[PDB]
Tab-separated table of C-alpha atoms and ligand atoms in Angstrom:
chain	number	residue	atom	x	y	z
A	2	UNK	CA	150.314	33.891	0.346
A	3	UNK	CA	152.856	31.268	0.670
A	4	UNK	CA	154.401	30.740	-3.038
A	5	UNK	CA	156.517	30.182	-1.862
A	6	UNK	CA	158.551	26.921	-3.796
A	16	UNK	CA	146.404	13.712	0.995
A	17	UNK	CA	147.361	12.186	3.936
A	18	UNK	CA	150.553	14.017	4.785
A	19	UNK	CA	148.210	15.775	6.485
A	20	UNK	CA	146.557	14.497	10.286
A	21	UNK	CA	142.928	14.133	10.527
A	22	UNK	CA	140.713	14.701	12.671
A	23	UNK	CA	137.468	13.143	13.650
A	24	UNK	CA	134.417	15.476	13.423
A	25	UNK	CA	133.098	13.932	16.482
A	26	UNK	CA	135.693	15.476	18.052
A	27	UNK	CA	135.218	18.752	17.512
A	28	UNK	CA	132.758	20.975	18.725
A	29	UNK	CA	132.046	24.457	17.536
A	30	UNK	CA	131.499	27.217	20.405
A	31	UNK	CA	130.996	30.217	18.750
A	32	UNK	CA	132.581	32.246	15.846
A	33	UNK	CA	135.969	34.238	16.148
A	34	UNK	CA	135.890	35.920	12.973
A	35	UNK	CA	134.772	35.359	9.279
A	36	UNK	CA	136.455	35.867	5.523
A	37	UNK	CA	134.844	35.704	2.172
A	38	UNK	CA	136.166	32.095	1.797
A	39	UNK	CA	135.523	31.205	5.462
A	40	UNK	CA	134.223	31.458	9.094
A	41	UNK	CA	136.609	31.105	11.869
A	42	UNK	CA	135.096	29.131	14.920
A	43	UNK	CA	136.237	28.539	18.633
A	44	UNK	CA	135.941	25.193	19.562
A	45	UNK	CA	136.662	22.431	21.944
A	46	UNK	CA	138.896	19.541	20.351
A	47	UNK	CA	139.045	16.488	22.530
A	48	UNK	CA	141.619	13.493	22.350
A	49	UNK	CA	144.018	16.088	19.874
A	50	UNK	CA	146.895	16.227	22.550
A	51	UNK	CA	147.705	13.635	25.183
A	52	UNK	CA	148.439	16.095	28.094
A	53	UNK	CA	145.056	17.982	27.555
A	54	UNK	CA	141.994	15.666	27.567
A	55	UNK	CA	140.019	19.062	26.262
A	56	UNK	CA	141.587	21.777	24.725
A	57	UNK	CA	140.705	24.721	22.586
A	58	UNK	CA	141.257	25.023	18.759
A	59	UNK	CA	140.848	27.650	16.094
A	60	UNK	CA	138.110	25.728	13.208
A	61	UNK	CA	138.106	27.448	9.770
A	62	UNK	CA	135.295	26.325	7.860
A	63	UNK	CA	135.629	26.243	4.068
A	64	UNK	CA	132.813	28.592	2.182
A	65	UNK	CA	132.490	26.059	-0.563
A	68	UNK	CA	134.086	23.928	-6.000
A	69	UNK	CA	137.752	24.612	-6.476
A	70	UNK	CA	138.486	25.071	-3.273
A	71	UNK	CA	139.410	21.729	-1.671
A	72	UNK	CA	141.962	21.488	-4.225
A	73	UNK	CA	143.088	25.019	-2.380
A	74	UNK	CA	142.319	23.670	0.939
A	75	UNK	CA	144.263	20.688	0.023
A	76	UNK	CA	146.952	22.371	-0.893
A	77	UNK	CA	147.784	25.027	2.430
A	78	UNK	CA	146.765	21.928	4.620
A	79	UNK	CA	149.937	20.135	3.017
A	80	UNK	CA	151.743	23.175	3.245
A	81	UNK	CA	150.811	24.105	6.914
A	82	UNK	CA	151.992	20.653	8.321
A	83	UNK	CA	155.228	20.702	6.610
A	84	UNK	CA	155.774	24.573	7.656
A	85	UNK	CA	156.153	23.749	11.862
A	86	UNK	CA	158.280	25.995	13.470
A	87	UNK	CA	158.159	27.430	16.891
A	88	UNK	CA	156.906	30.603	16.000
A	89	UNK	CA	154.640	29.329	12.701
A	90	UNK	CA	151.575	28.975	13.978
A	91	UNK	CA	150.410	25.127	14.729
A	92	UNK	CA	148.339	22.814	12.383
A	93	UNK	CA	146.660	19.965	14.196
A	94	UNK	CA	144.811	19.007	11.041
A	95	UNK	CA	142.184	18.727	9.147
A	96	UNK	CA	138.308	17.177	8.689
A	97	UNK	CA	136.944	15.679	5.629
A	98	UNK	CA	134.618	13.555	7.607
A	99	UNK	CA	131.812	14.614	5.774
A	100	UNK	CA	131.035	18.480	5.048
A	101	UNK	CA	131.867	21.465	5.818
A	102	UNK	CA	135.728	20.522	5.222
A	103	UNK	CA	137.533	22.086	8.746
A	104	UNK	CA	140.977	23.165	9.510
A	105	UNK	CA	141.853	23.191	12.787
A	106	UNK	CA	144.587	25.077	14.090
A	107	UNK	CA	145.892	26.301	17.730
A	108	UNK	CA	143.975	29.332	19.473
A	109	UNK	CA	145.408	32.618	19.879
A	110	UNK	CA	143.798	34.365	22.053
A	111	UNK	CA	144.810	37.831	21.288
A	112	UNK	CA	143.988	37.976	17.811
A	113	UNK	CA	146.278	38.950	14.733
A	114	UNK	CA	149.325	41.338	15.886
A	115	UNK	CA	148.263	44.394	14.331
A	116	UNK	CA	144.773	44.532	16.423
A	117	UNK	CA	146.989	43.653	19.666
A	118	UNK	CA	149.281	46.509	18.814
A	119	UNK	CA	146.493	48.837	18.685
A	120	UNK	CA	144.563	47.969	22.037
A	121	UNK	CA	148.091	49.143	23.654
A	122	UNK	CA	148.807	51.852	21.865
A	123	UNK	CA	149.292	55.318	23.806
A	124	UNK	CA	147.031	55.891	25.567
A	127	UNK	CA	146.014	50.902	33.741
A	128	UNK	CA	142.996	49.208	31.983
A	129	UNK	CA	144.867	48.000	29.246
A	130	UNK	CA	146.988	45.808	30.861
A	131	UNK	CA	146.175	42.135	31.797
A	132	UNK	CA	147.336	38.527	32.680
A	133	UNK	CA	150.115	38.674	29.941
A	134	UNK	CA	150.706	42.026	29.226
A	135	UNK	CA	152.012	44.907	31.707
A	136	UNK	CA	149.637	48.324	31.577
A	137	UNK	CA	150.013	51.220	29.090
A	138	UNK	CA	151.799	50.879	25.839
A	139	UNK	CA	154.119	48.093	25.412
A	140	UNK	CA	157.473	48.926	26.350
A	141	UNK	CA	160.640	49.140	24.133
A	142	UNK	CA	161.662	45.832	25.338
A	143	UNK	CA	157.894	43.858	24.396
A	144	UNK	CA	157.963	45.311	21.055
A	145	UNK	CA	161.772	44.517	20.136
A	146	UNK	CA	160.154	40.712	21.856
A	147	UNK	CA	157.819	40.724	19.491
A	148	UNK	CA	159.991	41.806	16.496
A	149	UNK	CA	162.555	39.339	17.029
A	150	UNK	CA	159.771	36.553	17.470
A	151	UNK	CA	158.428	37.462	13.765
A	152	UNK	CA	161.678	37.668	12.252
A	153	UNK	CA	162.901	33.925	13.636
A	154	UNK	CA	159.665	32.831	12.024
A	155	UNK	CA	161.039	34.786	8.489
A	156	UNK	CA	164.467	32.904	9.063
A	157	UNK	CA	162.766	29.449	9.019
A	158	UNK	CA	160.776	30.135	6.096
A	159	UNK	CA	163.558	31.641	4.201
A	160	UNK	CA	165.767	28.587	5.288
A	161	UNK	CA	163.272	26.194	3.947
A	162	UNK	CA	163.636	28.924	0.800
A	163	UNK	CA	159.843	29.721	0.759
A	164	UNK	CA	158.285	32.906	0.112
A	165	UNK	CA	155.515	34.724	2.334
A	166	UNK	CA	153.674	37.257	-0.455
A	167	UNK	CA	152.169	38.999	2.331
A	168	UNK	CA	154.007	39.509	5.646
A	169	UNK	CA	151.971	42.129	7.553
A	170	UNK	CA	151.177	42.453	11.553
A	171	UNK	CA	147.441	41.431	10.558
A	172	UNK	CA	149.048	38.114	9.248
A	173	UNK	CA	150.619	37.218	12.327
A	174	UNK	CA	148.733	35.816	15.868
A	175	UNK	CA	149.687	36.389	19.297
A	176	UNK	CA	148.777	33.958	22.029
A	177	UNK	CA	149.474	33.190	25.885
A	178	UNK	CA	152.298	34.729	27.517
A	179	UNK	CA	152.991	36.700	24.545
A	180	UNK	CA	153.710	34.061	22.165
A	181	UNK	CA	153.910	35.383	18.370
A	182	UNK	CA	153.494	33.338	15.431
A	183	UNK	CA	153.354	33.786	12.011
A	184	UNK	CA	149.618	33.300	9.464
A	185	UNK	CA	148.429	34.088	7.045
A	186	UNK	CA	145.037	35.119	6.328
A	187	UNK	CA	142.338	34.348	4.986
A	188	UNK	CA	140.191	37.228	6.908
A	189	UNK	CA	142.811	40.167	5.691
A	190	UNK	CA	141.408	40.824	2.349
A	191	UNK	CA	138.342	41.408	4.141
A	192	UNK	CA	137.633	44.482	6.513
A	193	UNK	CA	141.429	44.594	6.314
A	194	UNK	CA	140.092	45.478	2.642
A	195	UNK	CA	142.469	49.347	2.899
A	196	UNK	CA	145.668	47.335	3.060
A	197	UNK	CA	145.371	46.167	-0.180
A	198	UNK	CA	145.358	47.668	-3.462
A	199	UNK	CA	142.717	45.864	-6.169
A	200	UNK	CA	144.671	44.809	-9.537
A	201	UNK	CA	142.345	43.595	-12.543
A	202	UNK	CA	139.587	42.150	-11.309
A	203	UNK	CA	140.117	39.609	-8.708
A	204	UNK	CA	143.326	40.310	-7.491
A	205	UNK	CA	144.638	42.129	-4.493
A	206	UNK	CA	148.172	43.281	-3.307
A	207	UNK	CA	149.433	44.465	-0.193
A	208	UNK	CA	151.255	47.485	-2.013
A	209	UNK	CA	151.952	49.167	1.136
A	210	UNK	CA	154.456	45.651	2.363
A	211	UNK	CA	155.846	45.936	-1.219
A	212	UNK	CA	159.757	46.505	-2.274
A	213	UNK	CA	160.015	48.483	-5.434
A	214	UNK	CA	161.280	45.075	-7.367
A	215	UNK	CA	157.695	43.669	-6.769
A	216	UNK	CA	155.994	47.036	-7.794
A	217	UNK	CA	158.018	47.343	-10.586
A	218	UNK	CA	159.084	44.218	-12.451
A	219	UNK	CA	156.369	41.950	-10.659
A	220	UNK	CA	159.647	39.828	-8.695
A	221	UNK	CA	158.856	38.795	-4.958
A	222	UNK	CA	161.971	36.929	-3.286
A	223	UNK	CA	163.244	35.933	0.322
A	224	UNK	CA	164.834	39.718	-0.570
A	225	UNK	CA	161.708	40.823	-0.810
A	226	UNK	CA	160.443	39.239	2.482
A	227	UNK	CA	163.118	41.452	4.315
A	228	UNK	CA	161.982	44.715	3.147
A	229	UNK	CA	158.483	43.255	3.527
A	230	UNK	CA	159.378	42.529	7.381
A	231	UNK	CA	161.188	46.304	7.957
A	232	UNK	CA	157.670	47.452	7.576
A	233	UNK	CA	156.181	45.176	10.140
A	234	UNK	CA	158.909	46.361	12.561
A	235	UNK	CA	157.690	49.617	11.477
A	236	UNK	CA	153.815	48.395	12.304
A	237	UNK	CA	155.367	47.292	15.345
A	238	UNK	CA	156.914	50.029	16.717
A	239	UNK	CA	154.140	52.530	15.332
A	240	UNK	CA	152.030	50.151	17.141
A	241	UNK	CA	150.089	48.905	14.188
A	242	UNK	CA	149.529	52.146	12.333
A	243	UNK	CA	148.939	51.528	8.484
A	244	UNK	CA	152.101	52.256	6.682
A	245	UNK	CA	152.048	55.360	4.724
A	246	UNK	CA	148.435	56.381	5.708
A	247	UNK	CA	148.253	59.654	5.076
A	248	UNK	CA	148.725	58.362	0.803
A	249	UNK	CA	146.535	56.770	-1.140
A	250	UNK	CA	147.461	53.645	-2.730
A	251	UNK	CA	148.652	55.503	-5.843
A	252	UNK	CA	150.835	57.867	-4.325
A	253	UNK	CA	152.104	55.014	-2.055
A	254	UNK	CA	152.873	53.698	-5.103
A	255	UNK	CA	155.289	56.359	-6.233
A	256	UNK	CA	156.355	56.837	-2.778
A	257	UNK	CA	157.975	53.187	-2.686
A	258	UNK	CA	158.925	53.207	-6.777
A	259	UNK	CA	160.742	56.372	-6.381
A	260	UNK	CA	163.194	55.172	-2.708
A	261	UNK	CA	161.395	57.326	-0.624
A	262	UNK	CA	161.137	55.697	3.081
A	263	UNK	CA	158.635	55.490	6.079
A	264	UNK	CA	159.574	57.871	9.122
A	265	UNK	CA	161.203	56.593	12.494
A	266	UNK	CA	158.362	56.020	14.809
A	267	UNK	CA	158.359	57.843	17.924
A	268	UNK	CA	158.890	54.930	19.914
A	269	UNK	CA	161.535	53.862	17.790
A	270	UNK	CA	165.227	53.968	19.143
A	271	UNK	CA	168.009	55.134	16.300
A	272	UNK	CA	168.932	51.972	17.007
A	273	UNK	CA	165.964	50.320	15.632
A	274	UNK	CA	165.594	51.901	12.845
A	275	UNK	CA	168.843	51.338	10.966
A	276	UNK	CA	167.814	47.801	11.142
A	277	UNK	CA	164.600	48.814	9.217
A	278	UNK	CA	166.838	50.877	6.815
A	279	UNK	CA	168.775	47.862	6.499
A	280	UNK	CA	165.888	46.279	5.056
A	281	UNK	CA	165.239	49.172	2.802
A	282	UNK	CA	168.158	49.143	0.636
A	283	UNK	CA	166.688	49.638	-3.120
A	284	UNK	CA	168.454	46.994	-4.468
A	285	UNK	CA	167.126	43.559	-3.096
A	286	UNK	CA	170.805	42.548	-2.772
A	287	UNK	CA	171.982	45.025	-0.627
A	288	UNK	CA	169.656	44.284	2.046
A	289	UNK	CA	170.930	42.538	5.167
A	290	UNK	CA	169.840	38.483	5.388
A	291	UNK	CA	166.747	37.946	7.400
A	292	UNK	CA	169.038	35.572	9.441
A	293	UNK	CA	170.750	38.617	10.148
A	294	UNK	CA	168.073	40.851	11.065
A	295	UNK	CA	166.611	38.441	13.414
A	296	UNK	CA	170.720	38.165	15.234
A	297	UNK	CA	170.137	41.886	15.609
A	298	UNK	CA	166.738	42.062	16.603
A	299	UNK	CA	167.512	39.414	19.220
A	300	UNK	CA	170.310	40.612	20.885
A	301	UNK	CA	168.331	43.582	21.731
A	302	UNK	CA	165.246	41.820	23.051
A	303	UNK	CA	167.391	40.020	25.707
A	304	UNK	CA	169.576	42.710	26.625
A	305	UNK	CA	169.739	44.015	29.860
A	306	UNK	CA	167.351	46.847	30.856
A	307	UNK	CA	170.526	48.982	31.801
A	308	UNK	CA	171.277	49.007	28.016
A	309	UNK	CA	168.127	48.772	26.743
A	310	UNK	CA	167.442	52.128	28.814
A	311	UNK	CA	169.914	54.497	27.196
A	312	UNK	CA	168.793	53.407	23.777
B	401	A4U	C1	146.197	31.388	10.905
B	401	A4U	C2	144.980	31.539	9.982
B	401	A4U	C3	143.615	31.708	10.633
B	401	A4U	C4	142.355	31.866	9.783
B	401	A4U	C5	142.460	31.842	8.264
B	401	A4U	C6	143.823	31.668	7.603
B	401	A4U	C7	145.084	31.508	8.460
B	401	A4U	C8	146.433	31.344	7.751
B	401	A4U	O1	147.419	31.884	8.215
B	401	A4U	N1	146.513	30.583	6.540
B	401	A4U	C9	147.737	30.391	5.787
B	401	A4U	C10	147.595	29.984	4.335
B	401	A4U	C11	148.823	29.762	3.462
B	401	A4U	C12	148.623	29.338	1.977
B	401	A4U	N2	148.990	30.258	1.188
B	401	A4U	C13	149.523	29.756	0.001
B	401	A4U	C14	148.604	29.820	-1.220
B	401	A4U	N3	147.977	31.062	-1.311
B	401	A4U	C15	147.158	31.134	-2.542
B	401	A4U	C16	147.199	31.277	-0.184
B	401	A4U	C17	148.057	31.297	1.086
B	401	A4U	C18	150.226	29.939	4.056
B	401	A4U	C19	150.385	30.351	5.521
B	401	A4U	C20	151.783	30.537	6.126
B	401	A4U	C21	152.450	29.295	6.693
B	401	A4U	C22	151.864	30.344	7.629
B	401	A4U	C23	149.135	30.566	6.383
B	401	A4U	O2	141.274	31.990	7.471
B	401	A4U	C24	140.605	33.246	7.705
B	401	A4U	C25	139.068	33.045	7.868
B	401	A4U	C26	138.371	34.436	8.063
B	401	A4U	C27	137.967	34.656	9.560
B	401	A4U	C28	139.182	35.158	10.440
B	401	A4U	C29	138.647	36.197	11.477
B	401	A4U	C30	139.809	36.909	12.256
B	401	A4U	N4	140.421	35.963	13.165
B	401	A4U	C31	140.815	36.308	14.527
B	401	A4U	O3	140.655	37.435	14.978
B	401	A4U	C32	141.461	35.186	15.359
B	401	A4U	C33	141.464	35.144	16.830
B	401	A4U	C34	142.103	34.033	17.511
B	401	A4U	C35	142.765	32.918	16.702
B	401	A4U	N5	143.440	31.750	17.032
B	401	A4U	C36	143.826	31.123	15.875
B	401	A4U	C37	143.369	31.917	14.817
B	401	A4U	N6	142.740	32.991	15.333
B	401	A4U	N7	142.086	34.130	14.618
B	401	A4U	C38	143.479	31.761	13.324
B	401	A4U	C39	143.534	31.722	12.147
């Protein structure tokens, strides 16, 4: 959730599209893989992500994130071509990523060779990959907060990972669905991510760019727990008191000491005494390109 505060938006022709098969599918929408010809110069035929809309209200909804998706171009946001309201369904076509939503790639290498392929070295990823990835996420957080927006639900299974290791941030769309234990049902239709929240947002119902910083300690915690479910041995309840009551997630073995005072950083109770995201991403960085000789005795 981006809230975060017709044509700005590019279209494209439906012609030029054509489904392959389906990636994925939400409650709102199917996810296709398709071939999109004449979108980029370079590439006479290229591959694109295709969300198809479900259905009344919602093309004032898909109006809406398409405006917001072209505005929101970064270098690690993920990339909006456009969209097509040639006719029906309404499509949103975004780039491919073809290894899926970061908390799935974390998992397929996790301890535990076979793992390993074109862009990614065998057995689990190594200390320097997973500060790569962490510092790739958080550049992504500085933008936003720079722009001053607000993501209500920064998680691993929100982001995308593509070629060469390329990590951008989403937002889906598919993760209140079969993603259904990471969020905590509120009334009747709503769902939050209780797990990602600071105790300001449990409590008093406040989300800020503060908030987004303890939100994004917890995906370095994902990260470096390599996409375990934060606090899953509690159920949402006692997660609930767990966060309400300043008691924090364990250093993951992986983790360096390092590491994790950055993610304490991000856990300071009050929202104020929290590093800046702008800050955390410095840190983060620093470490992902240093040297294996000091990355080695961390
Ligand atoms: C990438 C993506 C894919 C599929 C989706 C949704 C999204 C997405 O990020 N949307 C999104 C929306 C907002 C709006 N915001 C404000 C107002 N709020 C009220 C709402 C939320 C804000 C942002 C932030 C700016 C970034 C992002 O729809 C999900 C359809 C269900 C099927 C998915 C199946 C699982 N998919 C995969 O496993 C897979 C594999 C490869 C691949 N390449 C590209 C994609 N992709 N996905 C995608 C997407």
């Amino acid at each position: 959730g981006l809230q975060g505060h017709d044509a700005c938006v590019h279209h494209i022709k439906r012609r030029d599209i054509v489904l392959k098969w389906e990636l994925g599918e939400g409650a709102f929408g199917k996810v296709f893989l398709a071939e999109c010809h004449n979108l980029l110069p370079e590439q006479d035929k290229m591959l694109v992500a295709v969300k198809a809309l479900k259905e009344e209200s919602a093309r004032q909804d898909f109006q809406r994130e398409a405006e917001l998706l072209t505005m929101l171009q970064h270098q690690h946001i993920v990339r909006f071509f456009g969209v097509c309201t040639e006719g029906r369904p309404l499509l949103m076509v975004l780039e491919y990523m073809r290894h899926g939503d970061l908390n799935r790639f974390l998992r397929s290498h996790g301890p535990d060779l076979l793992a390993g392929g074109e862009d990614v070295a065998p057995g689990p990823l190594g200390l320097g990959q997973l500060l790569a990835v962490a510092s790739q996420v958080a550049a992504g957080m500085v933008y936003l907060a720079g722009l001053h927006f607000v993501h209500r639900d920064l998680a691993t299974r929100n982001c995308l990972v593509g070629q060469g290791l390329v990590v951008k941030i989403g937002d889906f769309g598919m993760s209140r669905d079969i993603y259904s234990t990471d969020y905590y049902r509120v009334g009747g239709r709503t769902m939050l991510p209780i797990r990602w929240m600071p105790p300001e947002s449990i409590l008093y119902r406040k989300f800020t760019t503060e908030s987004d910083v303890w939100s994004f300690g917890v995906v370095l915690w994902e990260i470096f727990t390599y996409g375990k479910q934060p606090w899953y041995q509690l159920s949402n309840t006692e997660a609930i008191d767990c966060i309400t009551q300043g008691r924090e997630l364990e250093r993951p073995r992986a983790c360096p000491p390092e590491v994790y005072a950055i993610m304490r950083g991000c856990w300071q109770r009050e929202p104020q005494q929290r590093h800046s995201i702008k800050d955390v991403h410095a840190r983060l960085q620093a470490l992902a390109q240093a040297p294996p000789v000091y990355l080695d005795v961390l």
